[PDB]
Design an enzyme around this catalytic site. Structure first.
Site, short mmCIF file in Angstrom:
data_model
loop_
_atom_site.label_atom_id
_atom_site.label_comp_id
_atom_site.label_asym_id
_atom_site.label_seq_id
_atom_site.Cartn_x
_atom_site.Cartn_y
_atom_site.Cartn_z
N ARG A 9 0.84 -1.30 0.03
CA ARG A 9 -0.11 0.00 0.05
C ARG A 9 0.83 1.27 -0.01
NH1 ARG A 9 -3.02 3.14 4.59
NH2 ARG A 9 -4.63 4.13 3.54
N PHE A 31 1.95 10.88 0.87
CA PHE A 31 1.58 10.39 2.24
C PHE A 31 2.33 9.45 2.73
CE2 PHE A 31 -2.24 7.96 4.30
CZ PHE A 31 -1.80 8.23 5.59
N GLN A 87 3.70 1.82 2.60
CA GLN A 87 3.29 0.77 3.86
C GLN A 87 3.66 -0.85 3.32
OE1 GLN A 87 -0.42 1.25 5.25
NE2 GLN A 87 -0.71 -0.96 5.94
N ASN A 90 -1.61 -0.07 12.04
CA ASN A 90 -2.39 -0.56 12.89
C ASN A 90 -3.52 -0.98 12.43
OD1 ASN A 90 -3.90 1.56 13.75
ND2 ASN A 90 -1.92 2.30 14.86
N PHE A 149 4.97 1.77 8.09
CA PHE A 149 5.23 2.71 7.06
C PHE A 149 6.30 3.80 7.26
CE2 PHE A 149 2.92 6.19 8.97
CZ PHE A 149 2.13 5.72 9.98
N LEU A 178 -1.83 11.39 12.45
CA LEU A 178 -1.49 10.24 12.96
C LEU A 178 -0.88 10.12 14.44
CD1 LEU A 178 -0.20 8.44 9.69
CD2 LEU A 178 -2.76 8.40 10.55
N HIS A 225 -0.61 6.14 15.77
CA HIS A 225 0.45 5.28 15.42
C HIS A 225 1.72 5.53 16.00
CE1 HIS A 225 -1.90 3.80 11.79
NE2 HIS A 225 -2.49 5.03 12.04
#
Ligand SMILES: CCOC(=O)CNC(=O)NCc1ccc(N)cc1
Length: 164
Positions: free
Chosen positions: A54, A59, A62, A101, A112, A121, A125
């Site tokens: 991903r 951004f 991941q 998560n 990531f 985040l 995270h």
């Protein structure tokens, strides 16, 4: 001091290079230890062979699902999941290394690397390190992502381990 580990990344079977990560064991020892041992493979399982599944431009990138290979799985050295150690480190900018998560206290092996500041985040995270070297590799990986997160190239961590 804090461990350095590496990820050697291929894209469609051609090497992109090496990403070196400092793990902030001084702040998050349990989270750092997990990632370190998953890099070495010393528990019988780890990141070697797994994918960046991903990747979303502007951004993050991941990876780390080495059980289901699709972003639903992975596991830690302690068990399937482990708690959020703390949220002391913040998502301050590009190169920040943080745990993926599925809500509070569901850290496994997925992680990531941010390509921008992802301040939303913070407190959700666990940040546990950053890119020491190879941000050029992270930007290549970012270039093969899409808005949906679907990658346009097969991005594989061919090799990994601990440098110190
Ligand atoms: C910027 C990071 O965005 C996410 O983490 C989106 N969540 C996500 O992919 N969840 C799937 C997942 C399942 C099990 C574990 N251990 C970790 C993650």
């Amino acid at each position: 001091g804090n461990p350095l580990v590496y990820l050697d990344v291929d894209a469609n079977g051609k090497p992109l290079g090496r990403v070196v990560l400092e793990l902030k064991a001084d702040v998050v020892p349990k989270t750092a230890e997990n990632f370190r041992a998953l890099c070495t493979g010393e528990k019988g399982f780890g990141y070697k062979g797994s994918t960046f599944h991903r990747v979303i431009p502007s951004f993050m990138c991941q990876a780390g699902d080495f059980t289901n290979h699709n972003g639903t799985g992975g596991k830690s050295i302690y068990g399937s999941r482990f708690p959020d150690e703390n949220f002391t480190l913040k998502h301050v900018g590009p190169g920040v290394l943080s745990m993926a998560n599925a809500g509070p206290n569901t850290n496994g092996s997925q992680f990531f690397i941010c390509t921008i500041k992802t301040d939303w985040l913070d407190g959700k995270h666990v940040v546990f390190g950053h890119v020491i070297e190879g941000m050029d590799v992270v930007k290549k990986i970012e270039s093969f992502g899409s808005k949906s997160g679907r990658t346009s190239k097969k991005i594989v961590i061919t090799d990994c381990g601990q440098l110190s």
